[PDB]
Enzyme design. Structure first.
Site, mmCIF file in Angstrom:
data_model
loop_
_atom_site.group_PDB
_atom_site.id
_atom_site.type_symbol
_atom_site.label_atom_id
_atom_site.label_comp_id
_atom_site.label_asym_id
_atom_site.label_seq_id
_atom_site.Cartn_x
_atom_site.Cartn_y
_atom_site.Cartn_z
ATOM 1 N N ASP A 1 -3.217 -12.799 -0.393
ATOM 2 C CA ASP A 1 -3.437 -11.940 0.819
ATOM 3 C C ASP A 1 -2.404 -10.963 0.775
ATOM 4 O OD1 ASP A 1 -4.057 -11.236 3.264
ATOM 5 O OD2 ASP A 1 -3.686 -12.627 4.261
ATOM 6 N N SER B 1 -5.653 7.436 3.282
ATOM 7 C CA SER B 1 -6.704 7.961 2.503
ATOM 8 C C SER B 1 -7.017 9.221 2.982
ATOM 9 C CB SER B 1 -8.059 7.073 2.638
ATOM 10 O OG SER B 1 -9.087 7.678 2.229
#
Length: 330
Positions: free
Chosen positions: A35, A199
């Site tokens: 994770d 992004s």
């Protein structure tokens, strides 16, 4: 040194991925959910409330000659999906794919929430976010990656998740046969303890690319792709019959639909998520309404590049003094 381990979807939907991890001496092998959005290595154990164990493999520290109780230490964690676990702490030897750390904090669960009990395939979590998020008290503990870093050939690990198929986590090296073209690297903020990056935009299907900054985290422990409501609406608007259902808890679409791809920007580069990666199947057994793999982050408080996005790429988690993230197509 280096390590290399295969990671395997837990079910036909890629809801999560498990990677075998050796703990203790002699080894006890548990299947952990790696994770990158948390920083605790915790396991089902011999100390876990019996009624809360349902098929998981447990770590038994008393059977490990190298286990030592970390006196006074406890841990307690709650995840973004509302699940939780807590317990006490041992140090022991932990190996992943041939890479060994001695003295790793292994957090032994005394209690787990129902979501964990109900998932027989996941024996615990191995956190790979920054150690500043580790929940052990009163002495915060380091992640497996942080403990291994100095010994690694290069201070990196990579995630290469498969679509409906096994993939690979590598530590300490970049497998240049595992991706196509070049790796594009982008800046990381560690201010929230996550692999947080920006992004450069998105496209839906064959549509034009929209340049826009989307701050979010690279999180292998989250199944879906969670993005701003504007982006998500623009995606599902291209699917006939798709709608946001409050009763179901997000966007659903007719199972008869063909889903468009979704592209996200990494610097000047582009990662394409095929439409089929966005299909999470019937909302309930036998339904013709299917659950979408791209969902709104509104009310999460952060955008999450979960497995839906990451499995479309070869992803480098660069833990150099100034950490960065790299993405390549594959």
């Amino acid at each position: 040194s280096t390590g290399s381990a295969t990671t395997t979807p837990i079910d036909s939907l890629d809801d999560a991925y498990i990677t075998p991890v050796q703990i203790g001496t002699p080894a006890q092998t548990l299947n952990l959910d790696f994770d990158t959005g948390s920083s605790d290595l915790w396991v089902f154990s011999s100390e876990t409330t019996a009624s809360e164990v349902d098929g998981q493999t447990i770590y038994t520290p008393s059977k490990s000659t190298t286990a030592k109780l970390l006196s006074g230490a406890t841990w307690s964690i709650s995840y973004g999906d509302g699940s939780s676990s807590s317990g006490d702490v041992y140090t022991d030897t932990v190996s992943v794919g041939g890479l060994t750390v001695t003295g790793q904090a292994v957090e032994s669960a005394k209690k787990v929430s129902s979501s964990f009990t109900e998932d027989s395939t996941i024996d615990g979590l191995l956190g790979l976010a920054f150690s500043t998020l580790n929940t052990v008290s009163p002495t915060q503990q380091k992640t497996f990656f942080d403990n291994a870093k100095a010994s690694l050939d290069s201070p990196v690990f990579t995630a290469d998740l498969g679509y409906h198929a096994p993939g690979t986590y590598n530590f300490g090296f970049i497998d240049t046969t595992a991706y196509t073209g070049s790796i594009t690297y982008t800046a990381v903020s560690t201010k929230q303890g996550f692999w947080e990056w920006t992004s450069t935009g998105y496209a839906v299907g064959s549509g034009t690319f929209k340049s826009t900054s989307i701050d979010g985290i690279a999180d292998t422990g989250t199944t879906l792709l969670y993005l701003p409501a504007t982006v998500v609406s623009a995606y599902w608007a291209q699917v006939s019959g798709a709608k946001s259902s409050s009763s179901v808890g997000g966007y659903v679409f007719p199972c008869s639909a063909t889903l468009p791809s979704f592209t996200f920007g990494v610097g000047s580069a582009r990662i394409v998520i095929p439409g089929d990666y966005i299909d999470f199947g019937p909302i309930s057994t036998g339904s013709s309404s299917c659950f979408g793999g791209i969902q709104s982050s509104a009310g999460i408080g952060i955008n999450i590049f979960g497995d839906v996005a990451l499995k479309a790429a070869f992803v480098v988690f660069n833990g150099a003094t100034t950490p960065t993230l790299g993405f390549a197509s594959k």
